[PDB]
Amino acid sequence: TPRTSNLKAPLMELSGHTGEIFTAKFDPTGTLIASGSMDRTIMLWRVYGDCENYGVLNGHKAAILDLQWSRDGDILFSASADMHLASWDLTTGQRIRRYIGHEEIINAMDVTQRGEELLISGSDDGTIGIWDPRTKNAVDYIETDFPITAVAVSEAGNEIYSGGIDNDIKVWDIRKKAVVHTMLGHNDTITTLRVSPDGQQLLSYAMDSTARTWDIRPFAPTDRHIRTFDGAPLGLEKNLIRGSWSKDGKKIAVGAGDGTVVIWGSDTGKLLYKLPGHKGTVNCAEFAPDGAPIILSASSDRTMLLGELI
Amino acid sequence: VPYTGENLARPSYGPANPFKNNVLTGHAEEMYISEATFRAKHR
């Protein structure tokens, strides 16, 4: 079993950023790659074939710290530490517009994959902004008393998964602008909240080097905590590590501060992989949304490793 | 890949010698971190 995929090599090292990569996301058809990095740039690659850097997007005045794709994969969504959001066009390589209204650094954002289009930005002033991707003004914003480093949209499109430095996952409702309930249990600062593809589990990695999976389902006990996977210690930097799910919801991949991306089995809690290959901390560990065994790990070695899981 | 996690999680058999760095004084490997983190810890 040498190689079972469509890449022309079992490993590919995408390089060309002059600064640390913080996020990298796949096109929801598993075909296009976008990586935003602290040199204020979004580099756009192909994943299948010779994998050329077909595009570069400039226009952010500070470090880029998130980006999601659209429904089709034609409009990119970049949050950046210049207190701004931005919607970008990939037909021309230009920028559609910028979204303004935050006062401090923006750490998270989320686009509603199905439902109605909303951008959800968590920002260090203590705010969760809900934006429509046609008008630059904020449709709404929810006020907290702590910085927000993590944000996810519910399957039903009205609950917001905030995670702050106050050490607990908070689920808010958009209509009442108030918290529904808090899954507490973490000890350190939350970094990523990614919903399961079927929609009943939530991944959450915090600065305490533990990644926990929680419940989403409306019928659940008082403690919604399913499991506390361990085995990915966090390094020297306090980066915002971004984990993800596989397509089948069976494998949990989270980067770690030793340059290794760690994959557990989400069903039982067994370390499936501990893949090395990076020098500094691994910031964004993602799966292929199509279901192929392709994994991507973008790390602050200014690099991305696109590899296989055979 | 050298399998998945089974051969990464096991010890090599046998006892050690009763009887690998690169620098004489120790071991040094290159790394990339943000310069602000280094400045913060230095300060």
């Binding site: 090292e13 390089s15 690659w45 050329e52 850097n53 370390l271 | -």
Partner: peptide, 20 residues
């Protein structure tokens, strides 16, 4: 008007295995 950037793609290896 997507201009081609300075990125390159090189096959590589994941290096030495790391202890748990």
């Amino acid at each position: 008007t997507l201009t081609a950037g300075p990125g390159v793609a090189r096959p590589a290896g994941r290096g030495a295995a790391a202890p748990i």
